[model samples]
Structure formats: C-alpha cells, structure tokens
Target: EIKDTLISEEQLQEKVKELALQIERDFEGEEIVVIAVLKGSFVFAADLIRHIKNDVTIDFISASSYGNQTETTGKVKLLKDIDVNITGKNVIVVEDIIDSGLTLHFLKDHFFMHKPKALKFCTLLDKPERRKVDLTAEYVGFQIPDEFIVGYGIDCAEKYRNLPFIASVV
Candidate 1:
C-alpha cells in the first residue's frame, strides 16, 4: 500500500511545464530528439513533450536494472534500443527517476556510441544519495530521498502506475 504522497498531480504538472520551458529555451531553433526510458517515464515524457514549445522528435528505449524489486540487481540490461538515428542530433534522455544511476549510466554510454551532436539527461525525480555511479541529469524536477516510490508512471511489481500522484510504499 502507499504510505504517503510525495508529490501531487498538480505539482508534477507544474514541474513538467517548468522543465519544458527550460528545454524550449535551450533548444530554441533546433529539432531535439527526446528519448524516453520506457515503462517508467512514459507518462512523464508524454506530458513533458506536449508542453515543450520547440520542434522535437520522440523515441523510446527499454532498459532495466530492477525487476519488480526496490533495489537494483546491479545488472543492467538493454531490452530495447531507440529506433531513430540520433547521429548529429541534439538528444535528451527522459527518465522517471534517477536512483542508483546504473541504468542511465549504461544508457548514456550506449547512446554516446551513436555520436549524437549532443546528449543530455532529464528526470522527474532524483535520488543522489543512492547513486552508485557518477551521473547527473541536466533537467531535474525533484530531488528526493531514498525510498520505494511508485505511481505517476512509476511502478512496483508493475502496479500502481495509474495513480496520478507519486507515493512511497510502506
């Protein structure tokens, strides 16, 4: 069960808009490729892209280090890769949360090989205390503590993703 709400839907929406504005200002006249890390960032990416007032293309990649558990297994796997060719294009990797940083670190390395013009990271939630790798998101919504969070497109056992707000599980 959810123990408490960490972020309300209104708060999430406001943050998404704020991030979008920052992205818009940074990428003004350029067509940026927004790659969403799947299963978790789906909702956030969708809403964020809508608020972005710039020419943008969207893609998805599926990777996993955690499997229905609160802690990562320390093994990162790329279940899927982005289909769009990001070569020479400004790319933004959107994630639901940045926890251990292992998954994003692995992904950044993979994307770097594609030789995109530029690559940046973004996340709705950031948990720097739990980081096991040296990484940071250029666009961050919130910095949170170490906890098992769900809802707002994040899940546990593939459930609770439909909830409108973010919550911590007890």
Candidate 2:
C-alpha cells in the first residue's frame, strides 16, 4: 500500500521533457538506440521517447533480480534480450530507477558484448544511498532518498504501476 506521494504527476512530466531535451542535444544528428529495461521502464520510455527530437529506435530487454520483493537478490536474470543489432551504434539504456546498481551493472556488461559505438545510462530516478556497486547514470531525472518507491511504471508485485505519481510503500 502507498504511504505518501513522493513525486507528483506534473513533476514527472516536466522531468521527462527535461531529460529528453538533454538527450536530444547529446546525440544531435545521430541515430541512437534507446533500450528500455522492462517492465518498470515501459511507461517512462514511452513518455520520454515522444519528447525526444532525435532520430531514435526503441527496444526492450526484460531483466529481474527481485521477483516479488523490494530488495534485490543480487542474482540478475535475463528474461528477454534485445533483438536489434547495436554494433557500432549509439545506445542508451533507460531504466525506471537505480537502487542496488547490480542489475544495471549486469546490463552494462551484457550490452558491451554487442560492441556498441557508445553506451550510456539514463534513469528516471537514482537512489545512490542504496547503491552497492559503483555504477552511475549518465542522465538522471531525480536523485531520490532511500525508499521503496512504486508507481509511474515502477510497481509492487506488479501493482501500483498504473499510478500517475510515485509513492512510498507503507
């Protein structure tokens, strides 16, 4: 159950636009592949891609470390992998949030195998306080405090993802 709202819907939208503009400037005149880490980043990816003016291709890769729990098991699993050929292409991994940084670290190594021209990270939220690894996002929407946040594409047992705003679990 939600205890209190952390981010309002309006704030979320504004931040998405801001991130998009930064992306647009960063990759001007370049075709970039934006790989979304499902299923948490789907909503954020959809909203973010629309605001970006650059030539973009979208793909999704499903990975999980936390099954039904809030904390990661530290064992990353690849449920689905990217189908697109990312070799020599600019790639950006989009995620809903960064907590323990294990999943993102695993993903960064995985994507590098494809030999992308450049690989960068973008996330809607960053919880550096909870980081157990040295990973960092190149583009961050918000630096959030340590909390079990759900909503805006993030969830608890596949629920609360439909919430327009982000909230903490009571």
Candidate 3:
C-alpha cells in the first residue's frame, strides 16, 4: 500500500511546540496532568509534553467497546485506567484523533466522574464530519476531510504508525 503525505515530520514537530505554548499560557504556573489515550496518542503525547515546561505529570489509559462478539455495540469500557488521583487537578486528556467521537465523549464523562478540577480534550487531528456527536476538542492540531489516515502514530492495521509523518493511505 502507498501513502500520501498529510503532515510531514517537521511540520508536526513544529506544531507541537505552538500548542505547548498555548497550553502553557492557559494555566500559567499551575500544575497539570497529561492523561494520554494509549496506542495512537503515545507519539504525539511524547512530543507535546517535552515542550510543555510547566509542572506536568503523565499517565496513560486505554478504552475499548464491550461488543465482545463482533462489531462495537457502542458501549465502551476502559481497558486500562489511570493510577493517578486527579481530583482537584487540571487534567488534559490527549488523543491522536477524533473521528466518530463517541469514545472521546465517553471519556470526557468518565473522566469527570474522577472529579478533576478541570478537563480539556486535546487532539492531534479532527474529522468532524464523521462525528457521531459533533464533538469539538478544546485543543486541536489539524482538521482533515473524512479519510483514513495513518502515520505519526495513527495506524492502518497497526502498520505505518512508525512512519514519521502523517499521511493518507493511497
């Protein structure tokens, strides 16, 4: 399979710092927690937090639908939960992309139950037209037309994630 570039490595790396600065100013000197969604967001989260100079802590979580037999039944459950206690702390939930958005929205509600002082959803990409909920992220890097993209930690059959840039399968 061939792929066409969507975001090149340098472009994405540069974008991370700008977002990091934005996040830095928003909370000023306050401490924050970065709760990264596992798998896809790992690479982006890794690059982002390195530029966010403020007091920051990191954690990871994973979730999947409980439709055990076949396709997803739309009921999602956490495969891994955060070990950190987030109550009364500024929390940023990081995601690689927001497509249908049900999972991200579910995460927002679920994270709320933990009583974080504030919660913000941040993503590297957004495909809003495909949304099941018209969900919007508090911080977003790029918006793509509805398409299957892979790279920069986004994957197609768990392949191409090791690619340094984001691309559309061609």
Candidate 4:
C-alpha cells in the first residue's frame, strides 16, 4: 500500500507559479525558449507557461526510459528534437521529474553542442537518491524521496499519470 504524498497539487501549483516568476526575472530583456519533455511533462508545462511573465516560446520533445517497468532504463534516446533553433537564446528544459539523471544529462549534453547562449533545467520533482549520473536541476518544485511516483505527469507501466497529486502505488 502507498504511504503518503510528500507534496500536494495545491502546493505544486503554488511552487510552479513562483518558479515561473523567478525564470522571468532571470531572463529579463532576453528571449526565453521553454522546451517541455513530451508525453509526461505536458500537463505541468502547460500550467507553468501560464504563470511565466515573459514572452516565451514553447515546444515539446517526446522521450521515455520506462518501457514496462518502474526502473531506470539507463539509456537515453531522442524520440524527437526541437524544431526551433536554440542558438543564442536562453533555453530551459522542463520536465516532470529528474530521476537517475541519465536522460536529463544526455539531453543537456546534446543541447550544449548546439551552443545556446544559456541553458537551464526546471523540474517539478527531484529524486537525487536515484541519480546515476552527475547532474542536478536548477529549479525544482519539490524534493521527494526515492519512491515510485505517479501523478502531475509522472507514470508507471503507462498508468497513473492523471493523478492530481503525486502518489506512490504498491
């Protein structure tokens, strides 16, 4: 059985808005491009953009490590790439969660080669205990334990992504 949720939807929404405002301040007088990792980050990304106070361009990229289980695949693959050129722009990658760090690290490394003026990461959840790569999120909505979480755009075995608040299933 699931025990408890460290974070709640109301709290997440509040934090997301705060994060967006912070991003606006950090990128004042600069163009900011927000790329949301698709399929999973769709919901949070949409809500987050609403709170951002700057002129922002948004895009999506679909990628996943979970095939049919709740463990890291340890491999990162690009299912798609951004259509807009990231050159000389403040690029921020938004994700539902940062776990294992392999996927986020690989994606950041790939984008770094594109020579963006600046690159940053924002995640709704961070599970540092599960990280297998040396990476971290610049902005985080919540720090959660190393547990199987689903909701607010996270999923397992293709289910539970629709939960309004984050939860663990047994």
Candidate 5:
C-alpha cells in the first residue's frame, strides 16, 4: 500500500498549538471538558491538550460510521460514551476528521441531550465538499480537498492510525 504524506508531523503539532492557544483565548477563565471522539481523535486530543493552558477535564467516546471501511455509511452508531457528566459544563468534542459530517453532527445532537452548558465541535481536518449534512465545526485545523486520508489519528481498516503524519493512500 503506497501512501503520500499530506500534513507533516511538524505541521500537525504547530496547528495543535495554535488551536490550543485559540481555545484558551475563547474560554479564558472557564473550566472545560474535552471529549475526544475515540479510535481516531485520541492522538490529536492528546497532543492538543498538552499545549492548552487551561483547566481541562478529559473524556472519550467511540462512535462509528465507517467500520472496517474507508467510506462512511452515513449512519452513526454509538459504540461508547463518556462517563463524565457534561451537564452544565462547557464541552468540546474533538474529532480527527469530519469527512461526511455524519458522525460529528450526530454526536452534537446526542450530546445536546445531556444539556451541556455549551457544546462545540472541533476537528483536526475537515472535508467541506463531502458534507452529507449541514454541519460546521466551531474549530477546524485544516480544510482539505475530498480525499481518503489516513494517519495522525485517522485510519482505514484500523491500519494507519498509528502513523505520525496524515497521508493519502495511493
């Protein structure tokens, strides 16, 4: 399997730091809960929160629309949920990529039912042209053209998630 690098490791870390700084500016004195969408965004959340100089509580959830596949099924299936009660707490759901905007939008609605004080979505990558729903994230790291990218916390067939930089499988 040939892979072409897209976002280099240095580039990824720089954006993580930049986004962290922006998060601090927006939520100045407030304590926030960062919910990482599992199986993909964990690495990104890990890198991001270390640079975020704020009171942060970490949590994880596992939602899937693409199980053992490269393309999404456009239906979100909640596999796991956060144990932390986000009720009345500022929350941000960090994702690795918003490909079809299916899972994240579904997660936003599902989380809103918990009645959080504020619920926002953040993604390391966004494919605007592939949006299957009318959804946009509050924080986006990179806007890329429609491509099946893997690595830097993204995967296909659970293979390339451990790669240090994002790449497009060729």
Candidate 6:
C-alpha cells in the first residue's frame, strides 16, 4: 500500500503541545482525570498528559462502534472501563479521532449517567464530513478530511497504528 501523508510528524507534535497548554490554562486548579479511549488514543493520550503541568490522573477505556468496517455502527460496545469513581469529578475523555461522532455520543451519554460534575471531550483528529450525529470536540489537534487515515495512534485493520505520523492509504 502507498502512503499519503496529511500532516508531518513535526506538525502533529507542535499542535499537540499547543493543545496541552490550552488545557492546562483552562483547568488549572482542578484535579482532572484524563480518560483515554484505549487502542486508538494511547499514543496521543501519552503525549498530551506529558505536556501538561498539573496534578492529573490517567485512566483508560476501550469502546467500539465498528466491528471490522471503516464506518461506525452508531452503537457503542464497552470493552474496558476505568476504576476511578468519577462522581462529581472533572473528567476529560481523550480520543485519537472522531469520525461520525457516534461512539462519542454514546460515550457522552454513558458518562453523564454517572453524574460527574463535568465531562468534556478532547480529540486529536476530527473528520467533519463523516459526522452523522451532531458533536464537537472542545480540544482538537487537527481537522482531517474524510479519508481513512492511519498513524499517530489511528489504524486501518489494526495494521498502521504504530506509525509515528498521520497518513492515508494510497
């Protein structure tokens, strides 16, 4: 397969660092819990957490809406959950990408049911064209087209997740 790079490694890193600074400013005094959606967002999550200068906690959850396809099924399946009790706590849901916004919708509703004090989303990449349900990320590193991108923690058939930068299959 050919590789089509959308953003270089340097570009992505710079954007992530900027996002970290913004987050730190907005949530300066709060004890924030950064919940990374596992498998896809692990790399971005690690990088984001490293840049922040504050007392923060990290956790992981694995939720899926796609079985083996590139499109979302609009339903969420929870593979794993965090052990921390989030009731009345400030929480940020970190994700690698947001395509159709289906899984995020599910996640928002699911987390809301637990009665947290506040919950927000922070995504590294977003594809607005593929968004079927209405949703927006508070923190986003890049605005990507509707291409099937892989790298920087995104994957195609779980093969390209290890790539250091973002690229599309060509």
| C-alpha RMSD for every candidate | 2.5, 2.4, 2.0, 2.8, 2.5, 2.1
The sequence of per-residue lDDT tens digits that candidate 5 reaches over residues 1-170 is: 63688999999989999999888888989999999988789899999999987889999998755563324535567788889989999998999888777667777889999999998888999889888788888889999988788898788888888899999996
Spell out the clash pairs found in candidate 2. none
**Positional deviation of 55 in candidate 2, in angstroms?**
1.3
User: Candidate 3: minimum summed lDDT over ten consecutive residues — where?
Assistant: 66-75
Question: Candidate 5, TM-score vs. the true structure?
Answer: 0.91
lDDT ranking, best first: 2, 1, 3, 5, 6, 4
lDDT of 6 by residue, 1-170 (tens): 63788888899889999999988888888888899998889999999989988888888988765564425545667878778888898889999888888878888888888888989899999888888889999899888877778898888887888888888796
lDDT for model 4: 0.83
Model 1 alpha-carbon drift over 4 Å, by segment? 66-75
State the number of backbone clashes in model 5.
0
Q: Itemize residue pairs with steric clashes in candidate 4.
A: none
TM-scores of the models, in the order given: 0.92, 0.93, 0.93, 0.88, 0.91, 0.92
**lDDT, each prediction:** 0.90, 0.90, 0.88, 0.83, 0.86, 0.85
Q: For candidate 1, write residues 69-136 as lDDT tens digits.
A: 32553456778888999999999999998888877877888999999999999999999988987898
User: Stretches of candidate 4 above 4 Å error?
Assistant: 1-5, 64-74
User: Please, what are the lDDT tens digits per residue for candidate 4 over residues 1-170?
Assistant: 44567578898889989999888889988878999998888889999999987888998886655553324534556778888888998999999988788788778888898899999999988889888788878888888877777787878877877878888776
Give the worst 10-residue stretch by lDDT in candidate 5: 66-75
* Candidate 3 lDDT score relative to the true structure: 0.88
Best by TM-score: 3
List, residue by residue over 14-69, the lDDT tens digit for candidate 3. Answer: 88998898899888979999999989999999999999999999999998776652
Candidate 2, residues 1-170, lDDT tens digits: the string is: 78999999999999999999999888888999999999999999999999987888999998766563325545577889999999999999999998888778878889999999999999999989888788979899999898789999999988999999999997
Badly placed stretches (over 4 Å) of model 3 are: 67-74
In candidate 3, which residue pairs get closer than 3 Å at backbone N, Cα or C atoms, i.e. clash?
none
